[PDB]
Write a protein that binds this ligand. Structure first.
Ligand SMILES: [Zn+2]
Length: 258
């Protein structure tokens, strides 16, 4: 259902069914770039997506997920702040009704037009459902989107959205290469946080890339034609599916770069 992003069931209401909403390590946060400190203990970040196997794209009524075959060690994230191997399971975005909002993390209070989350689970816990009962169960790689030139590796996503307009629709989505969504630089910030949607579980190591990708206005306009509702229900455009920044509390954001 029953949480959402509207006035009546959005982020300011989530705490009534998910009290960890007001916890000590909630996400997203504002990244104050002058306060974040370079951490020379960070080991090199390793994004290894060459054997990623995408399977399906799903409109889940909040966003769309591109799902991956995670039954073997294919597409993994390692290094950086992480101890161990984290396996890619899905990615999705958060975006706005207007270009001036849509990201979840902010940078010196700047909001980007959208934010990509590549979600990974720590293989030492055997499955995703076990990983989300652990303080180091997940790693989410976050990438900001700004509007300008088109991102050629996003267009295959854009062009399937027509087929998954409403909640509960899915389509085949094999052979998609998530490397085509990355920026050039892997400079990042990292901190310990949470899922940004209910159940808001505090299991995530966040790794947020500093360099945004550029997407075109036409690409993000097609994101904004999706629907939160099911087929045959009144149309509610899937826009503004982001949680605002949460209190930093007793956390430090570390930078990978000088
Ligand atoms: Zn997300």
């Amino acid at each position: 259902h029953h949480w959402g992003y509207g006035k009546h069931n959005g982020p300011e209401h989530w705490h009534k069914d998910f009290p960890i909403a007001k916890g000590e390590r909630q996400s997203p946060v504002d990244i104050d770039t002058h306060t974040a400190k370079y951490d020379p203990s960070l080991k090199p970040l390793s994004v290894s997506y060459d054997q990623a196997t995408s399977l399906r794209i799903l409109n889940n009524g909040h966003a769309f997920n591109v799902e991956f075959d995670d039954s073997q060690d294919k597409a993994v994230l390692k290094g950086g702040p992480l101890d161990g191997t984290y396996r890619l399971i899905q990615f999705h975005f958060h975006w706005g009704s207007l270009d001036g909002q849509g990201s979840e993390h902010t940078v010196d209070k700047k909001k980007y037009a959208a934010e990509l989350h590549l979600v990974h689970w720590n293989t030492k816990y055997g499955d995703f459902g076990k990983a989300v009962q652990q303080p180091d169960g997940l790693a989410v790689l976050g990438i900001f989107l700004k509007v300008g030139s088109a991102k050629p590796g996003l267009q295959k996503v854009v062009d399937v959205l027509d087929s998954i307009k409403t909640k509960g629709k899915s389509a085949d989505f094999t052979n998609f290469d998530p490397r085509g969504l990355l920026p050039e630089s892997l400079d990042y910030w990292t901190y310990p946080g949470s899922l940004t949607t209910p159940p808001l579980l505090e299991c995530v190591t966040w790794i947020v890339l500093k360099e945004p990708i550029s997407v075109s206005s036409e690409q993000v306009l097609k994101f904004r034609k999706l629907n939160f509702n099911g087929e045959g229900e009144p149309e509610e455009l899937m826009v503004d599916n982001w949680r605002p920044a949460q209190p930093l509390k007793n956390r430090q954001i570390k930078a990978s770069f000088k």
